[PDB]
Amino acid sequence: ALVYGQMNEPPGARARVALTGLTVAEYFRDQEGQDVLLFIDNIFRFTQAGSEVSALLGRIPSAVGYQPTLATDMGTMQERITTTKKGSITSVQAIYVPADDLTDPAPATTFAHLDATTVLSRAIAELGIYPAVDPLDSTSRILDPNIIGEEHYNIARGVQKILQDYKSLQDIIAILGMDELSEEDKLIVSRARKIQRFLSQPFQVAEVFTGHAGKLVPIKDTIKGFKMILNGELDHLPEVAFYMVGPIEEVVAKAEKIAESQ
Amino acid sequence: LEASTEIQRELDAELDKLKKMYGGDTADLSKFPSFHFEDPVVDPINM
Amino acid sequence: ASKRIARSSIDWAKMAESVPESQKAMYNQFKAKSDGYIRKALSYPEQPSPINWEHYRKSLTNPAMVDAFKKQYEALKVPYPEDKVSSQIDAQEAEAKKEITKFIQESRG
Amino acid sequence: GFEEAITLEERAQKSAEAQIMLFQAKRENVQFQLEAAYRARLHHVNNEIKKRL
């Protein structure tokens, strides 16, 4: 369901459009017991419309020109986005950072209610990996061995450590080369290339524009697949077998087809 | 006594949600459940 | 209880004084795999949580269900699991005794 | 060389004694695994009763 408060609207309509969409999501949660998704784009335009509404009322603006009720207005909007005994509402919100300042009052107020982070990187999209989610910039607060489990936490930490080692070695490879690296470094950079290739995935909604059938990989399949790549159990497979493939059984099937076609 | 329709609907929805959450659809939870000890296979002592 | 699961083991100190490393590298597995049976032994007690029946009596208008469930819980006792590996281990022990007797005879010679 | 050969035979005899210790530890480990499986099934029964309550 769409709401689409336009940019030519008065500031009151742009301030209440997020509440309208939240009301539709709240009906889907309370009266159906669903795990609703709410998309807000943009959430900085919500703050800007609230600031314009408060400035039209003649109130005294707070620091950096914002409304004095910025924290409580954000709180009242965001505390309705939670999980209750009937259902839950999960909100993915597009965030604009003014003047690239993360200490600005509107991003700093937004970050207090954030439970995760998904950073879409232009550089990863230049590498052909889709979705272009940055694996190091993106973070979550449920990365804990009590909510997601010990195995999920250890594998995610291992993948992050290997990718951090790859990013450290990228500068060395760029300035000197790859032949002088040790056998451990060559194994690390090969596993890291296979890990960052396995992060790509075909999407069903783009399957007309891509020609690849979309995959919905279950969480245990991703856990098992990255555990296999982390332990070096797929060192003999080529890197291209990991690209644009959902599960890991389709990775080894693509590697078998590559070997047979060779 | 003379309850409204919406309260009855919410009661039925909550009872169904708790039955699905507590696994009452698989077996009746008001009685004593039965258990089966999953027959164990130890590691090979020999090589 | 927790007697022969949580608070008992076998002395590995005299075990490591004979094994010729690469000859008996499976001892590195044996000290580790049995440690797995110690790690799950860190969990798994007899009664992990006693049931406060008084709390359920106070939290329920009709306490007859609480008394019925308490009676059913007291009427059921799980015994120790069946064993069929004892005869195999005894046969391995007897074969080990025969081979040790032969090896001792050869060592004496 | 003769004295070292004698001491190596003594070490072989001690290895046989520690093999007896290994077999005793084997049967102890089997009993530990069986008892631990009994504790898990006791835990599973208690957890199910708590879920019914």
Side-chain angles (χ1 to χ4, degrees):
Chain A
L2 316 176
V3 182
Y4 287 158
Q6 288 83 1
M7 208 165 54
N8 61 280
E9 299 273 359
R14 297 178 302 186
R16 302 297 178 260
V17 138
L19 303 184
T20 300
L22 178 51
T23 316
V24 184
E26 275 177 328
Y27 181 84
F28 283 146
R29 166 177 73 189
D30 299 319
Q31 298 295 325
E32 300 290 332
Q34 295 186 0
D35 296 327
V36 205
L37 276 205
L38 180 55
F39 290 92
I40 304 179
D41 192 0
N42 200 279
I43 208 182
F44 178 72
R45 299 295 197 269
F46 169 77
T47 295
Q48 189 190 32
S51 171
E52 291 171 18
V53 162
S54 300
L56 286 184
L57 293 178
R59 307 186 179 183
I60 289 297
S62 184
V64 206
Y66 291 99
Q67 63 270 40
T69 57
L70 164 67
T72 170
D73 283 0
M74 183 68 58
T76 49
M77 199 274 297
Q78 297 273 43
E79 282 241 325
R80 301 167 62 188
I81 305 175
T82 180
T83 157
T84 179
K85 299 182 178 179
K86 300 181 182 300
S88 66
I89 293 174
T90 316
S91 193
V92 185
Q93 298 145 175
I95 298 188
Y96 174 76
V97 177
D100 306 74
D101 188 13
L102 281 85
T103 54
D104 191 283
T109 315
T110 312
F111 293 159
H113 307 294
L114 253 51
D115 285 311
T117 288
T118 302
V119 175
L120 295 181
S121 182
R122 183 59 174 176
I124 299 200
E126 296 299 321
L127 300 179
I129 301 165
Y130 289 104
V133 182
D134 204 320
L136 303 180
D137 289 63
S138 60
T139 178
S140 181
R141 296 200 57 168
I142 62 174
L143 284 176
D144 188 287
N146 296 123
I147 309 176
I148 64 180
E150 284 276 351
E151 194 175 11
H152 191 172
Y153 176 69
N154 288 133
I155 289 166
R157 289 302 290 181
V159 169
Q160 283 174 355
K161 184 181 290 94
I162 270 194
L163 293 173
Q164 281 168 179
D165 297 334
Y166 176 82
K167 185 173 287 299
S168 66
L169 265 62
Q170 274 297 286
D171 299 65
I172 302 179
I173 290 177
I175 65 178
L176 303 188
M178 213 175 59
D179 49 76
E180 78 279 354
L181 307 181
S182 61
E183 187 182 359
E184 174 195 359
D185 296 328
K186 288 179 183 179
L187 183 59
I188 282 301
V189 71
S190 67
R191 289 180 185 177
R193 273 183 164 264
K194 297 172 183 181
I195 279 177
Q196 75 175 200
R197 222 54 53 86
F198 193 50
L199 292 166
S200 56
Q201 182 181 178
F203 284 169
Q204 181 185 349
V205 299
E207 86 186 355
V208 182
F209 274 93
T210 56
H212 325 306
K215 305 294 177 183
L216 201 162
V217 201
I219 175 62
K220 285 183 176 58
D221 289 5
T222 73
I223 282 176
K224 184 182 65 178
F226 279 100
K227 192 178 63 177
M228 286 174 55
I229 305 175
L230 274 183
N231 299 344
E233 303 181 8
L234 307 174
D235 287 334
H236 50 280
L237 305 185
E239 297 176 3
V240 207
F242 298 89
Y243 182 79
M244 208 56 64
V245 165
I248 203 69
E249 287 80 15
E250 300 184 2
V251 158
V252 73
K254 184 178 180 183
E256 285 171 4
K257 292 300 295 177
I258 284 176
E260 290 300 318
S261 179
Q262 181 179 357
Chain B
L1 181 60
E2 305 184 11
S4 66
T5 312
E6 300 184 12
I7 299 178
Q8 177 72 21
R9 290 177 186 177
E10 187 175 0
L11 164 64
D12 296 326
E14 288 296 325
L15 283 181
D16 194 12
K17 184 174 184 298
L18 291 183
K19 181 178 182 180
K20 293 180 179 182
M21 178 172 296
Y22 292 155
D25 313 65
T26 63
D28 192 11
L29 310 183
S30 61
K31 306 176 180 179
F32 179 74
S34 61
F35 314 99
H36 190 256
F37 31 88
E38 245 60 52
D39 272 56
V41 175
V42 302
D43 62 324
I45 295 101
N46 301 274
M47 178 175 58
Chain C
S2 296
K3 301 301 171 57
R4 315 112 55 188
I5 156 164
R7 306 181 185 183
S8 177
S9 178
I10 313 105
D11 174 71
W12 316 95
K14 298 184 176 181
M15 188 175 190
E17 297 180 2
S18 83
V19 281
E21 244 294 327
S22 61
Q23 177 181 329
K24 296 309 167 192
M26 303 297 185
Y27 153 75
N28 303 87
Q29 298 181 359
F30 188 81
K31 214 265 179 180
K33 294 178 183 179
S34 60
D35 207 337
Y37 304 116
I38 302 175
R39 282 172 182 178
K40 293 190 173 182
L42 298 177
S43 72
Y44 296 149
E46 195 269 346
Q47 181 76 15
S49 60
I51 298 180
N52 199 327
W53 307 103
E54 301 286 340
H55 179 61
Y56 286 91
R57 283 178 183 181
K58 294 172 184 179
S59 300
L60 293 186
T61 305
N62 201 332
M65 301 177 300
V66 186
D67 306 337
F69 271 107
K70 181 183 180 180
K71 187 175 184 179
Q72 288 175 349
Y73 188 82
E74 289 186 350
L76 258 300
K77 172 191 173 296
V78 194
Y80 299 145
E82 287 276 353
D83 185 20
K84 290 183 181 181
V85 217
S86 61
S87 60
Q88 321 167 24
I89 290 178
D90 292 328
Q92 292 171 194
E93 178 192 3
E95 293 170 355
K97 286 169 178 176
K98 299 162 190 175
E99 292 181 2
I100 280 162
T101 310
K102 180 181 180 180
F103 199 87
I104 282 178
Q105 169 196 355
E106 295 174 355
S107 300
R108 285 168 183 170
Chain D
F2 287 164
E3 296 160 9
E4 286 182 4
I6 291 302
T7 60
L8 261 51
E9 292 295 327
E10 301 158 359
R11 286 192 177 97
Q13 298 158 347
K14 298 179 187 60
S15 178
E17 304 149 18
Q19 185 189 189
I20 309 174
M21 297 182 177
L22 155 87
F23 276 92
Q24 203 276 341
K26 279 179 175 181
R27 74 182 192 94
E28 282 279 348
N29 190 23
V30 171
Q31 295 176 13
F32 266 67
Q33 183 184 347
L34 279 180
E35 191 178 4
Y38 165 71
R39 307 307 184 186
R41 302 307 185 267
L42 225 169
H43 202 330
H44 194 9
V45 167
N46 182 83
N47 204 338
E48 287 293 329
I49 292 301
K50 184 180 181 179
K51 190 179 180 182
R52 298 307 165 270
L53 263 302

CSV table of all heavy atoms in Angstrom, one decimal, chain A residues 116-163:
chain,number,residue,atom,x,y,z
A,116,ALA,N,19.2,-1.2,13.4
A,116,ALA,CA,20.1,-1.9,12.4
A,116,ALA,C,20.6,-0.8,11.5
A,116,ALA,O,20.5,0.4,11.8
A,116,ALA,CB,19.4,-3.0,11.7
A,117,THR,N,21.2,-1.2,10.4
A,117,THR,CA,21.8,-0.3,9.4
A,117,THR,C,22.0,-1.1,8.1
A,117,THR,O,22.6,-2.1,8.2
A,117,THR,CB,23.1,0.4,9.9
A,117,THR,OG1,22.8,1.3,10.9
A,117,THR,CG2,23.8,1.1,8.8
A,118,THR,N,21.6,-0.5,7.0
A,118,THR,CA,21.9,-1.1,5.7
A,118,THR,C,22.4,0.0,4.8
A,118,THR,O,21.7,0.8,4.3
A,118,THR,CB,20.6,-1.8,5.1
A,118,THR,OG1,20.1,-2.8,6.0
A,118,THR,CG2,21.0,-2.4,3.7
A,119,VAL,N,23.7,-0.1,4.5
A,119,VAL,CA,24.4,0.9,3.6
A,119,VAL,C,24.5,0.3,2.2
A,119,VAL,O,25.1,-0.7,2.0
A,119,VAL,CB,25.7,1.3,4.2
A,119,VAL,CG1,26.4,2.3,3.3
A,119,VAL,CG2,25.6,1.9,5.6
A,120,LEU,N,23.9,1.0,1.3
A,120,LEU,CA,24.1,0.7,-0.1
A,120,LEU,C,25.2,1.5,-0.7
A,120,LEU,O,25.2,2.7,-0.7
A,120,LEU,CB,22.8,1.0,-0.9
A,120,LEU,CG,21.6,0.2,-0.5
A,120,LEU,CD1,20.4,0.5,-1.4
A,120,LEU,CD2,21.9,-1.3,-0.6
A,121,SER,N,26.3,0.7,-1.2
A,121,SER,CA,27.5,1.3,-1.6
A,121,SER,C,27.6,1.4,-3.1
A,121,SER,O,27.2,0.4,-3.8
A,121,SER,CB,28.7,0.5,-1.1
A,121,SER,OG,29.9,1.1,-1.4
A,122,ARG,N,28.0,2.6,-3.6
A,122,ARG,CA,28.2,2.7,-5.1
A,122,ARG,C,29.4,1.9,-5.6
A,122,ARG,O,29.3,1.3,-6.7
A,122,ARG,CB,28.4,4.2,-5.4
A,122,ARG,CG,28.5,4.5,-6.9
A,122,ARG,CD,27.3,4.0,-7.7
A,122,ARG,NE,27.4,4.4,-9.1
A,122,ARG,CZ,26.5,4.1,-10.0
A,122,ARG,NH1,25.5,3.3,-9.7
A,122,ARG,NH2,26.7,4.5,-11.2
A,123,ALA,N,30.4,1.8,-4.7
A,123,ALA,CA,31.6,1.0,-5.1
A,123,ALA,C,31.3,-0.5,-5.3
A,123,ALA,O,31.9,-1.1,-6.2
A,123,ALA,CB,32.7,1.2,-4.1
A,124,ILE,N,30.5,-1.0,-4.4
A,124,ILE,CA,30.1,-2.4,-4.6
A,124,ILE,C,29.2,-2.7,-5.8
A,124,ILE,O,29.4,-3.7,-6.5
A,124,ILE,CB,29.4,-2.9,-3.3
A,124,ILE,CG1,30.3,-2.7,-2.1
A,124,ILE,CG2,28.9,-4.3,-3.4
A,124,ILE,CD1,30.0,-3.5,-0.9
A,125,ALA,N,28.4,-1.7,-6.1
A,125,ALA,CA,27.6,-1.8,-7.4
A,125,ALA,C,28.5,-1.7,-8.6
A,125,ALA,O,28.2,-2.3,-9.6
A,125,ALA,CB,26.6,-0.7,-7.4
A,126,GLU,N,29.7,-1.0,-8.5
A,126,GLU,CA,30.6,-1.0,-9.6
A,126,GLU,C,31.3,-2.3,-9.7
A,126,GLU,O,31.9,-2.6,-10.8
A,126,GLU,CB,31.7,0.1,-9.3
A,126,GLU,CG,31.1,1.5,-9.4
A,126,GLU,CD,30.5,1.9,-10.7
A,126,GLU,OE1,31.0,1.5,-11.8
A,126,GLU,OE2,29.4,2.6,-10.7
A,127,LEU,N,31.4,-3.1,-8.7
A,127,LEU,CA,32.0,-4.5,-8.8
A,127,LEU,C,31.0,-5.5,-9.3
A,127,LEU,O,31.4,-6.7,-9.4
A,127,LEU,CB,32.5,-4.9,-7.4
A,127,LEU,CG,33.5,-4.0,-6.7
A,127,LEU,CD1,33.9,-4.6,-5.4
A,127,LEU,CD2,34.8,-3.9,-7.6
A,128,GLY,N,29.8,-5.1,-9.6
A,128,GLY,CA,28.8,-6.1,-10.1
A,128,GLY,C,28.1,-6.9,-9.1
A,128,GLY,O,27.3,-7.7,-9.5
A,129,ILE,N,28.3,-6.6,-7.8
A,129,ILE,CA,27.7,-7.4,-6.8
A,129,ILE,C,26.3,-6.7,-6.5
A,129,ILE,O,26.3,-5.5,-6.2
A,129,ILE,CB,28.5,-7.4,-5.5
A,129,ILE,CG1,29.9,-8.1,-5.8
A,129,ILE,CG2,27.8,-8.2,-4.4
A,129,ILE,CD1,30.9,-7.9,-4.7
A,130,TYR,N,25.3,-7.5,-6.6
A,130,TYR,CA,23.9,-7.0,-6.3
A,130,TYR,C,23.2,-8.0,-5.4
A,130,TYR,O,23.2,-9.2,-5.7
A,130,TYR,CB,23.1,-6.8,-7.6
A,130,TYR,CG,23.6,-5.7,-8.4
A,130,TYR,CD1,24.3,-5.9,-9.6
A,130,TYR,CD2,23.3,-4.4,-8.1
A,130,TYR,CE1,24.8,-4.8,-10.4
A,130,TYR,CE2,23.7,-3.3,-8.8
A,130,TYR,CZ,24.4,-3.5,-10.0
A,130,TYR,OH,24.9,-2.5,-10.7
A,131,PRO,N,22.7,-7.5,-4.3
A,131,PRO,CA,22.5,-6.1,-3.8
A,131,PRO,C,23.8,-5.5,-3.3
A,131,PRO,O,24.6,-6.2,-2.7
A,131,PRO,CB,21.4,-6.3,-2.7
A,131,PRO,CG,21.7,-7.6,-2.1
A,131,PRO,CD,22.1,-8.5,-3.3
A,132,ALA,N,23.9,-4.2,-3.6
A,132,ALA,CA,25.2,-3.5,-3.2
A,132,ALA,C,25.2,-3.1,-1.8
A,132,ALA,O,25.5,-1.9,-1.5
A,132,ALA,CB,25.3,-2.3,-4.2
A,133,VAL,N,25.0,-4.0,-0.9
A,133,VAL,CA,25.0,-3.8,0.5
A,133,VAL,C,26.5,-3.8,1.0
A,133,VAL,O,27.2,-4.8,0.8
A,133,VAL,CB,24.1,-4.8,1.3
A,133,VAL,CG1,24.1,-4.4,2.8
A,133,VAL,CG2,22.7,-4.7,0.8
A,134,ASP,N,26.9,-2.8,1.7
A,134,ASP,CA,28.3,-2.8,2.2
A,134,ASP,C,28.3,-3.7,3.4
A,134,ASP,O,27.6,-3.4,4.4
A,134,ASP,CB,28.7,-1.4,2.6
A,134,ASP,CG,30.2,-1.2,2.6
A,134,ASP,OD1,30.9,-2.1,3.1
A,134,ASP,OD2,30.6,-0.1,2.1
A,135,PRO,N,29.1,-4.8,3.4
A,135,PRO,CA,29.1,-5.7,4.6
A,135,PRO,C,29.7,-5.2,5.8
A,135,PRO,O,29.5,-5.7,6.9
A,135,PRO,CB,29.8,-6.9,4.0
A,135,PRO,CG,30.0,-6.7,2.5
A,135,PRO,CD,30.0,-5.2,2.4
A,136,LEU,N,30.6,-4.2,5.7
A,136,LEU,CA,31.3,-3.6,6.9
A,136,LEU,C,30.6,-2.4,7.4
A,136,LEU,O,30.6,-2.2,8.6
A,136,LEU,CB,32.7,-3.3,6.5
A,136,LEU,CG,33.5,-4.5,6.0
A,136,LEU,CD1,35.0,-4.1,5.7
A,136,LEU,CD2,33.5,-5.6,7.0
A,137,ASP,N,30.1,-1.5,6.5
A,137,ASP,CA,29.3,-0.3,7.0
A,137,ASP,C,28.0,-0.7,7.6
A,137,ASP,O,27.5,0.0,8.6
A,137,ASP,CB,29.1,0.7,5.8
A,137,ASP,CG,30.4,1.3,5.4
A,137,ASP,OD1,31.3,0.6,5.0
A,137,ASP,OD2,30.5,2.6,5.5
A,138,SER,N,27.3,-1.7,7.1
A,138,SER,CA,26.1,-2.1,7.7
A,138,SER,C,26.3,-2.8,9.0
A,138,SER,O,27.2,-3.7,9.1
A,138,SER,CB,25.3,-3.1,6.7
A,138,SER,OG,26.1,-4.2,6.4
A,139,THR,N,25.5,-2.5,10.0
A,139,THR,CA,25.6,-3.0,11.3
A,139,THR,C,24.2,-3.3,11.9
A,139,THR,O,23.2,-2.8,11.4
A,139,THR,CB,26.4,-2.1,12.2
A,139,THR,OG1,26.5,-2.7,13.5
A,139,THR,CG2,25.7,-0.7,12.3
A,140,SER,N,24.2,-4.1,13.0
A,140,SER,CA,22.9,-4.4,13.6
A,140,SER,C,23.2,-4.5,15.1
A,140,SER,O,24.3,-4.9,15.5
A,140,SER,CB,22.3,-5.7,13.0
A,140,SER,OG,21.1,-6.0,13.7
A,141,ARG,N,22.2,-4.3,15.9
A,141,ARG,CA,22.3,-4.3,17.3
A,141,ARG,C,21.9,-5.7,17.9
A,141,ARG,O,22.1,-6.0,19.1
A,141,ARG,CB,21.4,-3.3,18.0
A,141,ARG,CG,21.8,-1.9,17.7
A,141,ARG,CD,21.3,-0.9,18.8
A,141,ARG,NE,21.7,-1.3,20.1
A,141,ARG,CZ,21.5,-0.5,21.2
A,141,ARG,NH1,21.0,0.7,21.1
A,141,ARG,NH2,21.9,-0.9,22.4
A,142,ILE,N,21.4,-6.6,17.1
A,142,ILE,CA,21.1,-8.0,17.5
A,142,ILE,C,22.2,-9.0,17.2
A,142,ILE,O,22.0,-10.2,17.3
A,142,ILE,CB,19.7,-8.4,16.9
A,142,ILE,CG1,19.8,-8.5,15.4
A,142,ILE,CG2,18.6,-7.5,17.4
A,142,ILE,CD1,18.6,-9.1,14.8
A,143,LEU,N,23.4,-8.5,16.8
A,143,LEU,CA,24.6,-9.3,16.6
A,143,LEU,C,25.1,-9.6,18.0
A,143,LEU,O,25.9,-9.0,18.6
A,143,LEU,CB,25.6,-8.6,15.8
A,143,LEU,CG,25.4,-8.6,14.3
A,143,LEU,CD1,26.5,-7.8,13.6
A,143,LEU,CD2,25.4,-10.0,13.7
A,144,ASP,N,24.5,-10.7,18.6
A,144,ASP,CA,24.7,-11.1,20.0
A,144,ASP,C,24.5,-12.6,20.1
A,144,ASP,O,23.6,-13.1,19.4
A,144,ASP,CB,23.8,-10.3,21.0
A,144,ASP,CG,24.2,-10.5,22.4
A,144,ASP,OD1,24.0,-11.6,23.0
A,144,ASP,OD2,24.8,-9.6,23.0
A,145,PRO,N,25.3,-13.3,20.9
A,145,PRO,CA,25.1,-14.7,21.0
A,145,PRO,C,24.0,-15.0,22.1
A,145,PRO,O,24.2,-16.0,22.9
A,145,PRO,CB,26.4,-15.3,21.4
A,145,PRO,CG,27.1,-14.1,22.2
A,145,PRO,CD,26.6,-12.9,21.4
A,146,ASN,N,22.9,-14.3,22.1
A,146,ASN,CA,21.7,-14.6,22.8
A,146,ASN,C,20.4,-14.4,22.0
A,146,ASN,O,19.4,-14.9,22.4
A,146,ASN,CB,21.6,-13.7,24.1
A,146,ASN,CG,22.7,-14.0,25.1
A,146,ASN,OD1,23.5,-13.1,25.4
A,146,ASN,ND2,22.9,-15.2,25.5
A,147,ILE,N,20.5,-13.6,20.9
A,147,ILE,CA,19.3,-13.3,20.1
A,147,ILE,C,19.4,-14.1,18.8
A,147,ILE,O,18.4,-14.8,18.4
A,147,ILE,CB,19.2,-11.8,19.8
A,147,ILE,CG1,19.3,-11.0,21.1
A,147,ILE,CG2,17.9,-11.5,19.1
A,147,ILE,CD1,19.3,-9.5,20.9
A,148,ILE,N,20.5,-14.1,18.1
A,148,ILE,CA,20.6,-14.9,16.9
A,148,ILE,C,21.3,-16.2,17.0
A,148,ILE,O,21.2,-17.1,16.1
A,148,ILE,CB,21.4,-14.0,15.8
A,148,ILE,CG1,22.8,-13.7,16.3
A,148,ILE,CG2,20.7,-12.7,15.6
A,148,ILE,CD1,23.6,-12.9,15.3
A,149,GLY,N,22.0,-16.5,18.1
A,149,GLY,CA,22.7,-17.7,18.4
A,149,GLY,C,24.2,-17.6,18.3
A,149,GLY,O,24.7,-16.6,17.8
A,150,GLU,N,24.9,-18.6,18.8
A,150,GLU,CA,26.3,-18.6,18.9
A,150,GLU,C,26.9,-18.8,17.5
A,150,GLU,O,27.9,-18.2,17.1
A,150,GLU,CB,26.8,-19.7,19.8
A,150,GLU,CG,26.7,-19.3,21.3
A,150,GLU,CD,27.8,-18.5,21.8
A,150,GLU,OE1,28.8,-18.3,21.0
A,150,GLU,OE2,27.8,-18.0,22.9
A,151,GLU,N,26.3,-19.8,16.7
A,151,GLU,CA,26.9,-20.1,15.4
A,151,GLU,C,26.7,-18.9,14.4
A,151,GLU,O,27.7,-18.6,13.7
A,151,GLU,CB,26.2,-21.3,14.9
A,151,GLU,CG,26.9,-22.0,13.7
A,151,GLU,CD,26.3,-23.3,13.2
A,151,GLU,OE1,25.2,-23.6,13.7
A,151,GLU,OE2,26.9,-24.0,12.4
A,152,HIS,N,25.6,-18.3,14.4
A,152,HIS,CA,25.4,-17.1,13.6
A,152,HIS,C,26.3,-16.0,13.9
A,152,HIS,O,26.9,-15.4,13.0
A,152,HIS,CB,23.9,-16.7,13.7
A,152,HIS,CG,23.5,-15.7,12.7
A,152,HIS,ND1,22.1,-15.3,12.5
A,152,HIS,CD2,24.1,-15.0,11.7
A,152,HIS,CE1,22.0,-14.4,11.6
A,152,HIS,NE2,23.2,-14.2,11.1
A,153,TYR,N,26.5,-15.7,15.2
A,153,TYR,CA,27.4,-14.7,15.6
A,153,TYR,C,28.8,-15.0,15.3
A,153,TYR,O,29.5,-14.1,14.8
A,153,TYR,CB,27.2,-14.4,17.1
A,153,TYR,CG,28.2,-13.4,17.7
A,153,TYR,CD1,28.0,-12.1,17.4
A,153,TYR,CD2,29.2,-13.8,18.5
A,153,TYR,CE1,28.9,-11.1,17.9
A,153,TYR,CE2,30.1,-12.8,19.0
A,153,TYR,CZ,29.9,-11.5,18.7
A,153,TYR,OH,30.8,-10.5,19.2
A,154,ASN,N,29.3,-16.2,15.5
A,154,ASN,CA,30.7,-16.5,15.2
A,154,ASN,C,31.0,-16.5,13.7
A,154,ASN,O,32.0,-16.0,13.2
A,154,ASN,CB,31.0,-17.9,15.7
A,154,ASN,CG,31.1,-17.9,17.2
A,154,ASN,OD1,30.5,-18.8,17.9
A,154,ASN,ND2,31.8,-17.0,17.8
A,155,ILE,N,30.0,-16.9,12.8
A,155,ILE,CA,30.2,-16.9,11.4
A,155,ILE,C,30.2,-15.5,10.9
A,155,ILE,O,31.0,-15.1,10.0
A,155,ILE,CB,29.1,-17.8,10.7
A,155,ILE,CG1,29.4,-19.3,11.0
A,155,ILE,CG2,29.1,-17.6,9.2
A,155,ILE,CD1,28.3,-20.2,10.7
A,156,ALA,N,29.3,-14.7,11.4
A,156,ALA,CA,29.2,-13.3,11.0
A,156,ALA,C,30.5,-12.5,11.4
A,156,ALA,O,31.0,-11.7,10.6
A,156,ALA,CB,28.0,-12.6,11.6
A,157,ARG,N,31.0,-12.8,12.6
A,157,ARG,CA,32.3,-12.2,13.0
A,157,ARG,C,33.5,-12.7,12.1
A,157,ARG,O,34.4,-11.9,11.8
A,157,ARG,CB,32.6,-12.5,14.5
A,157,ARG,CG,31.7,-11.7,15.4
A,157,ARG,CD,31.8,-10.2,15.2
A,157,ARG,NE,33.0,-9.7,15.7
A,157,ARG,CZ,33.4,-8.4,15.6
A,157,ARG,NH1,32.6,-7.5,15.1
A,157,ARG,NH2,34.6,-8.0,16.0
A,158,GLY,N,33.5,-14.0,11.8
A,158,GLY,CA,34.5,-14.5,10.9
A,158,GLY,C,34.5,-13.9,9.5
A,158,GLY,O,35.5,-13.6,8.9
A,159,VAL,N,33.3,-13.7,9.0
A,159,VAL,CA,33.2,-13.1,7.7
A,159,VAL,C,33.6,-11.6,7.7
A,159,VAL,O,34.3,-11.2,6.8
A,159,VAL,CB,31.7,-13.2,7.2
A,159,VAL,CG1,31.5,-12.4,5.9
A,159,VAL,CG2,31.4,-14.7,6.8
A,160,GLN,N,33.2,-10.9,8.8
A,160,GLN,CA,33.7,-9.5,8.9
A,160,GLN,C,35.2,-9.4,9.1
A,160,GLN,O,35.8,-8.5,8.5
A,160,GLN,CB,33.0,-8.9,10.1
A,160,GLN,CG,31.5,-8.5,9.9
A,160,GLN,CD,30.9,-8.0,11.2
A,160,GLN,OE1,31.4,-8.1,12.2
A,160,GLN,NE2,29.6,-7.6,11.0
A,161,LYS,N,35.8,-10.3,9.8
A,161,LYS,CA,37.2,-10.3,10.0
A,161,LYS,C,38.0,-10.6,8.7
A,161,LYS,O,39.0,-9.9,8.4
A,161,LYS,CB,37.6,-11.3,11.1
A,161,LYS,CG,39.1,-11.3,11.4
A,161,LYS,CD,39.5,-12.4,12.4
A,161,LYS,CE,38.9,-12.0,13.8
A,161,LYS,NZ,37.6,-12.7,14.1
A,162,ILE,N,37.5,-11.6,7.9
A,162,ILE,CA,38.1,-11.9,6.6
A,162,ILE,C,38.0,-10.7,5.7
A,162,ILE,O,38.9,-10.4,5.0
A,162,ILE,CB,37.5,-13.2,6.1
A,162,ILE,CG1,38.4,-14.4,6.6
A,162,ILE,CG2,37.5,-13.2,4.6
A,162,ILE,CD1,38.1,-15.7,5.9
A,163,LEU,N,36.8,-10.1,5.6
A,163,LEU,CA,36.7,-8.9,4.7
A,163,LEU,C,37.5,-7.7,5.2
A,163,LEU,O,38.0,-6.9,4.4
A,163,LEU,CB,35.2,-8.5,4.6
A,163,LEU,CG,34.3,-9.6,3.9
A,163,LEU,CD1,32.8,-9.2,4.1
A,163,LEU,CD2,34.7,-9.7,2.5
